[PDB]
Structure formats: C-alpha cells, structure tokens
C-alpha cells in the first residue's frame, strides 16, 4: 500500500527529484508523531471489543434497525453489522500507523457503497456507527493522539 514515508518517496520519483529538505521536513514530522501512534494503536487493539460495543449502543442499538423490518433485526443480521464495525476499526488503526489515508480506500472505501446498496444495508447508519467509534476511540486514546486518530475515522465517514 502507501504510507507517509513511501508517499513522499513516490511523489519524488515521478518528478525524478532527489530528496529535498522540504521533503525531509515532512518525513521528520512522521517520525516525531510515530512513537505515540504506536502507543495509541496498542490502546485501541486492547479495548477494541469494548469500543465496538459502546459505539453500537450509542447509535445502532435502540434504532429502527433493531425493530423487525430493519437491518439490525435478527441475530444473523446483528452479527454481520458488528463484523463491519470491527472492519472499520482495524483499518482505521492500520491507517493511524503509516499515517496515510489511502490504505483505507483501497481496502474499504472502493466498492462499499455498491455492496451496501446491493445488500440493502443503510449507508447513513454505518456512517453514524463510525462517528460513534470515533468518540469512544478518542477517550481511550487520550487527547494528543486523538486528533491523529480522528482523521482516519472522518475519512471513512465521508467516503461512505
């Protein structure tokens, strides 16, 4: 895929440029942030299961979907939605490390609206669930790394 280091490289090779200070500055920035991004990722992995459950509760649960004639309805349907929420989390974490949005869209965003429209899944709800995951994640993560972590969540939300 593409991550912040390789992104800078890739822009330079197409120009045929050797690495400039401007480029070296962007690269330094990643390395400063990186140490805590590693910390924040570990926090999110440990509490993942909890994070999802809290998020579902805030939006997905106690909605029309849970009521019969909604997508959440049934255990089978309920399970699927949780898997999707777990998907969104792993990627967002993978995106937090690396620091490049693109990992997201190659693996998640490309095609999603087309599957969801085909399955009948409601796009808006998923967007709400993602925003919920964002708030829970931010608390666990802590304030400094929250800004970082929020970016990848927002990308996912606007993609859908």
């Amino acid at each position: 895929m593409k991550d912040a280091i390789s992104t800078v490289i890739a822009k330079y090779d197409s120009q045929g440029k050797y690495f400039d200070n401007a480029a070296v500055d962007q690269l330094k920035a990643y390395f400063a942030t990186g140490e805590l991004r590693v910390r924040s990722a570990a926090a999110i992995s440990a509490n993942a299961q909890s994070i999802i459950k809290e998020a579902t509760a805030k939006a997905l649960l106690y909605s029309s979907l849970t009521r019969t004639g909604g997508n959440m309805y049934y255990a089978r349907r309920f399970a699927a939605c949780i898997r999707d929420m777990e998907y969104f989390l792993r990627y967002a974490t993978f995106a937090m490390v690396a620091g490049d949005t693109s990992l997201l869209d190659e693996y998640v965003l490309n095609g999603l609206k087309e599957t969801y429209t085909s399955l009948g899944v409601p796009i808006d709800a998923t967007v709400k669930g993602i925003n919920a995951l964002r708030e829970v994640v931010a608390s666990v993560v802590g304030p400094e790394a929250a800004g970082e972590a929020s970016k990848y969540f927002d990308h996912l939300a606007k993609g859908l």
């Binding site: 190659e106 693996y107 998640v108 490309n110 095609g111 087309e114 599957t115 085909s118």
Partner: protein, 193 residues
C-alpha cells in the same frame, strides 16, 4: 485446463487479459481480487515458455493453469479430493472492492463479454475519472458523418460506469483553432473561421 476442449472454448476466443479472469472463476472459485495478482498472472500467460522436455506443451497458457492449481490458496481450500466450487455470498464472506464485477463474472453470461473487467476496474480506481458521457460509456454516440451508433448493452456487454457529479465538466477538443476554445476564451466562437 490443458485439454484441447478447454481452449477454443475459452482462451482462443478471448484476449489474454480476459482469459486469466475467466480462468480465475473456473479453477479457483473467486473473482480476481487485486491489481497485483492480475499482474502476476498476466506475466505467466504472457511469458514465452522455458523449453520443456515434456512433449506436453511447455508453460504458455498451460503455465497459467499450472500456477492456479499449484497455488497454495487452491490446494488448501479445495484440497486434492474436492472439485473446485464457486465461493459466493453464503460462503467465505465475499469482498466489497470487486463486488459488482465479481457478480457479473459469476453469471453464465460472463463468457459473452470480451473486454476485460478486472484490470479495467483495478487501476480505474487509481486513475482520475475518464473522458465519457456522465450517464455512461454507452451513452456516447460514435462520431461519423451520418447515423446514430451506440454500443448496446445486451449485444455484447462492455459497460464502463464512472461516478461523475453534477459539477464535473467534460474536456472537449475544438474542431478549429485550439485557442478558439470557449473554456479559455468566451468570445472564441465569434472569431474568424
């Protein structure tokens, strides 16, 4: 796969990029899932064989078929006993990034489309959006003196859809002097022929 029947029915009527996509579907039950795999396989079928002592023709398209059966993904999921089955919505999850294409590949009408679908889709995601009618590739008439000739969806499926918002503007080439083009100058039509 190596048999005479398998080519001519498949392979011989398709271009090489389309053959590797059908050969995915029937040998492994999935559609081709990424840009890097359709590239690895395109180099296998493309590659002139290393000369083989086995009279059984060396590599070529046979290489393609080998590479699929010899693949761990193949052997593991199917095993030696099972005949390959089509994995589908019910089984093995099914990924979103190739959804639309894959469901077309699974239908029996699939061998009717001759234009490759997977390579076009992968790498249409990496590219900026194309030069085409907003409502679709089929909506652009062929540009000839007289006659309205469109591509018909049924007579040979070759759809290219692209998401083009209300705001997007087509780039059109001026029939005439380039600087006449009205995007760069509003008065260009009121100029000398």
């Amino acid at each position: 796969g190596k048999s005479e029947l398998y080519r001519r029915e498949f392979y011989q009527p398709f271009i090489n990029s389309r053959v590797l996509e059908l050969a995915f579907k029937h040998f492994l039950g999935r559609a081709p899932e990424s840009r890097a795999e359709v590239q690895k396989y395109f180099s296998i079928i493309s590659s002139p064989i290393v000369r083989g002592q086995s009279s059984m023709p060396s590599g070529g398209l046979y290489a393609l078929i080998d590479a699929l059966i010899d693949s761990e993904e193949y052997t593991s999921i199917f095993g030696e006993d099972t005949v390959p089955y089509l994995r589908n919505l019910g089984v093995e999850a099914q990924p979103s990034w190739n959804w639309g294409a894959a469901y077309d590949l699974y239908n029996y009408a699939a061998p009717r489309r001759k234009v490759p679908q997977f390579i076009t889709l992968f790498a249409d995601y990496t590219q900026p959006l194309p030069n085409q009618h907003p409502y679709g590739a089929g909506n652009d008439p062929l540009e000839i003196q007289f006659g309205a000739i469109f591509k018909n969806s049924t007579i040979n499926p070759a759809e290219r859809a692209a998401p083009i918002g209300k705001d997007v503007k087509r780039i059109l080439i001026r029939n005439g002097s380039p600087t006449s083009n009205e995007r760069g100058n509003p008065t260009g039509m009121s100029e000398g022929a």
